[PDB]
Amino acid sequence: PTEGRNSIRYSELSPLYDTTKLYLVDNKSADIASLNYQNDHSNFLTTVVQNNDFT
Amino acid sequence: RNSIRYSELSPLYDTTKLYLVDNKSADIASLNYQNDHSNFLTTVVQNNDFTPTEASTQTINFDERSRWGGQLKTIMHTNMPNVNEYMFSNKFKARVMVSRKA
Amino acid sequence: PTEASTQTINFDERSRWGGQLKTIMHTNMPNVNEYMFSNKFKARVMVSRKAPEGVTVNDTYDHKEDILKYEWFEFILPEGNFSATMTIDLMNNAIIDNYLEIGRQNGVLESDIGVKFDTRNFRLGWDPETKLIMPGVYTYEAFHPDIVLLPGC
Amino acid sequence: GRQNGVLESDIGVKFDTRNFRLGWDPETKLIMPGVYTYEAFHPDIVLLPGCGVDFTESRLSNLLGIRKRHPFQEGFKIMYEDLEGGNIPALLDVTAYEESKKDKKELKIQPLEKDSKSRSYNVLEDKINTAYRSWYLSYNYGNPEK
Amino acid sequence: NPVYPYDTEC
Amino acid sequence: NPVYPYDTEC
Amino acid sequence: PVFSKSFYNEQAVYSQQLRQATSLTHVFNRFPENQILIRPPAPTITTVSENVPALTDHGTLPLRSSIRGVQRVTVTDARRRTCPYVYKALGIVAPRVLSSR
Amino acid sequence: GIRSWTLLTTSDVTCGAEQVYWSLPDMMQDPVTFRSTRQVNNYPVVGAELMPVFSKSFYNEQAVYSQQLRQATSLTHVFNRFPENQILIRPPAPTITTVSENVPALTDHGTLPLRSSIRGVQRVTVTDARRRTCPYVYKALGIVAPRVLSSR
Secondary structure, eight states: OOOOOOOEEESSOOSOOSOOOOOOOSOOHHHHHHHTTSOOSSSOOOOOOOOTTOO | OOOOOOSSOOSOOSOOOEEEOSOOHHHHHHHTTSOOSSBOOEEOOOOTTSOHHHHHHSEEEEOOSSOEEEEEEEEEEEOOOTTOTTTTSSOOOOOOOOOOOO | OHHHHHSEEEOOOSSOEEEEEEEEEEEOOOTTOTTTTSSOOEEEEEEEEEOSSOOSSTTTTTSTTSEEEEEEEEOOOOOSOOOHHHHHHHHHHHTHHHHHHHTGGGTOOGGGOOEEEOOOOTTTTOOTTTOSOTTSSOOOOOOSOOEEEOSOO | OGGGTOOGGGOOEEEOOOOTTTTOOTTTOSOTTSSOOOOOOSOOEEEOSSOEEEOTTOSHHHHTTOOOSSOSSSOOEEETTTSOSOBOOOOOOHHHHHHOOOOOOOTTOOOOOBOTTOOBOOOOSTTSOOSOEEHHHIIIIIOTTO | OOOSOTTOOO | OOOSOTTOOO | OEEEEEEEOTTTHHHHTTSSSSSSSOSSOSOSSOGGGSOOOOOSEEEEEEEOOEEEEEEEEEOOSEEESEEOOBOBOTTSSBOTTEEEEEEEEEEEEOOOO | OOTTTSOOOOOOSSOSOOEEEEOOOSSBOOOTTOOOOOOTTTOOOSEEEEOSEEEEEEEOTTTHHHHTTSSSSSSSOSSOSOSSOGGGSOOOOOSEEEEEEEOOEEEEEEEEEBOSEEESSOOOOEEETTSSBOTTEEEEEEEEEEEEOOOO
16 A cells, blocks of 8 residues: 555665674874864874764 | 764665756766767756865765656656758658750 | 755655656857857967068969968857858857958968868859869859868968 | 937846857957847847846846756846956947058958947947846856856 | 859848 | 957958 | 757848859859759748757656656657767656555 | 757747746654754745746847848948958847846745744745845745644
8 A cells, every 4th residue: 555665775874783882082083173272192182983074 | 872973964764856967067067078869968056165086986876675656757858950961851862854965 | 955955955854755857948048158068169270471581483373372370279169049051150250250360370271271061063053074063163052061171270 | 318318328237048159250350340240149138337237136137047056045137247258349330440451451450339320329338248147147257157 | 164153142 | 460450350 | 959040041032142242153053044043032031940948847647656866867769769969858757646556 | 969968949948948946944753854043045945936937938020121120220341340341240149039038936835844843033044056145036935824733
């Protein structure tokens, strides 16, 4: 009747589960300039999102 | 039911569009030495992190436990000279007089 | 708009969906805009003419035929949208519009322009035996755009 | 205008299609045929100093195939001051060039100053640029990005 | 024979 | 050279 | 995408007398007197082969369940071959469901 | 010679009937394969149709007779500097003139999946083949009627 298990997929591996790693850098090239006028290396902020298509 | 997710919207289901371009900037140079606009090839994968070639390998995966099809709409333009030779609006036979005496 | 931005149109669920997007659009594109590259174009013309340092008489018709110079040029058009031809002559102007600037000033003759876009079937007025054009005219008829050239250019 | 000494010469706002400068030449820095070659190219607005044209309250702009590039504000009026470089060349004097065969080649630096009915062309000094500024030219022919 | 009658253009 | 033959307009 | 547009060749044969005189030559019309051999009259109505673009929906078709990232498309001509007068051909196709296993 | 090096086609005033990708993206779940982004130039296409730029054709009167009332009405032989050098003569005008003109284009792109939450301010963008802003765009009104499918 149009019930579904329709599923359009492909590579781009299923936003996966069960445990991954979170990289919490600080000198990542863009973080600096948008956010590190405010201070040092004792405290800062970092995009934990490693997608380069994002400011 | 551990699940690490985030934005990058679930490789979604139920119907999408497939763009089948031809003059997409990289397709050209990796693949269109071979010929024209009558036939070519195109990465249908719109991910710019991929050279057409490597993209070629990866698969768009329409799924199942139910097969399907697609509604193909299509745009096309041509520049055909009314008297082109390839359409034979060029040649033609006929016989004329070629000699006269006594 | 701003405050509205925040609030959400809420399509619901326990069933996702999609939308049928119909759409209207108009444009005003000048046939010879620059952004579509219906503006530029390269081509090389004659830019110099002399002979190596001794002016006239024995080669007074022949000295003129001894040194030629060519250079590549990107010349442009005035944006707008023009008739089939109009466009042509616009280049067939701006191709001259380069000559006049450098040709006269360096012995280049109009004779040797060397790059002329043009529609016409030079050879139509042909004949087998003379191997020439019997009416003394490249019968002035429009056939399809064409580019006439001189050597090197 | 008539009632207050204003001359036809100095009308100052004239919409018009045409590529004044088409009949140009490099060396004279004028129009060799003594005519802004009477050809239709695309609507254009020619101006004199100080006078201008505001569309804000109108659409005809869209007809004149001329439109703001950030179509959403209002810095949109056009003054003599904006059409930089887009001054009409000035036009060259034909007859002065002609009669001139005196013994000579100078004959013509003289750019037509006023038309027959003696209406002025407000030529200016230098004698190669009439202070008639026209949209088209400035946009298309003269000013890079300023 | 050149097959073009000369001077026939109005 | 002005490159425009004067008086050629009909 | 090759169709025909038609126009009104002005006053037919009067368009022709400003064409035996503007061509400067009687190139075709070698004989402007031999009633038989005279550059045929121009028709009241001229016709011109011109090409428009063609947007078309072909229907819906079954597709493999796996598409290689590089799809190859080909426009074949009646006697089945490459037509190089093809300018730009963009096909788009929206998949959709049907049936089930 | 060149019959092989190249090919003879017809005169296109449009000169390059180009396509343009329509892509609003804070609405559609983004079609397959596009990565989500907010880089104006990538913007997941929601649909594409070619330019509203086509070509109309007319009958330039008596071709060359339109040209002799144009070498005389222009007052100048501006282009046609040489009205005698058979070669350098302002090319004959063609029997048929062609003009790039733009019509408006009403198009249905299909039906697409959309996020279940739309921010009151949707952003729409018409991208051109080499993916960029086309400023010759006049007025572009997209409307979209949502609809149901599937279920959880």
